């Protein structure tokens, strides 16, 4: 699968950046996204998709093994809403 190392590599090849900068940039890219998210801000990346936050109340859950009923504590989750452009690019993709 695609990894930061592979992303760093493309930046190195395709854009002739130093391996140093191509490494920090990738890291910062994701870091900046986590940050905007931890501050409760939505992230909209045109051409790709949005990372939205949703607050989910507690609800019935359980232990799939034993079966012991357990509540799913309330929480705030990150969802990704792919855009149309991306969706189209991937509809006929064939899992490598």
């Amino acid at each position: 699968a695609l990894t930061k190392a592979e992303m760093s590599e493309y930046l190195f090849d395709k854009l002739g950046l130093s391996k140093r900068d191509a490494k920090e940039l990738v890291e910062l890219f994701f870091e900046e996204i986590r940050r905007a998210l931890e501050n409760g801000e939505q992230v909209k990346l045109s051409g790709f998709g949005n990372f939205d936050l949703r607050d989910k109340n507690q609800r019935p859950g359980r232990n799939p093994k034993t079966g012991e009923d357990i509540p799913i504590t309330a929480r705030r989750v990150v969802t990704f809403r792919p855009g149309q452009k991306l969706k189209s690019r991937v509809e006929n993709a064939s899992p490598k």
């Binding site: 695609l2 930046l11 940039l25 994701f30 790709f48 929480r75 989750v77 509809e91 993709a93």
Partner: protein
């Protein structure tokens, strides 16, 4: 935070990395992730999350506006699973 705003912030922070460079880099990284999924391959960024594809069986769907039927071929749609670090930093509730 939009893509352009993301480029701004990254640029502002780094004072040793040229703003134009940051711009070309982000665009390229996003394009890299997109084509990666189009090629039917996964993206695994430890601590952030992973992108993969989910299959949707063919199905007789509907134009929600008219009610007219529409035959839908099977397909793949994007799917993101937040990584532990990201899950936690985002979840403000206890």
């Amino acid at each position: 935070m939009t893509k352009s705003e993301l480029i701004e912030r990254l640029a502002t922070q780094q004072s040793h990395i040229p703003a134009k460079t940051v711009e070309d880099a982000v665009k390229e990284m996003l394009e890299h992730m997109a084509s990666t999924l189009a090629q039917g391959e996964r993206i695994e960024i430890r601590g952030f999350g992973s992108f993969s594809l989910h299959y949707r069986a063919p199905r007789t769907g509907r134009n929600p506006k008219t009610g007219d039927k529409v035959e839908l071929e099977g397909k793949y749609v994007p799917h993101f699973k937040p990584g532990k670090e990201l899950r936690d930093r985002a979840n403000i509730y206890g």
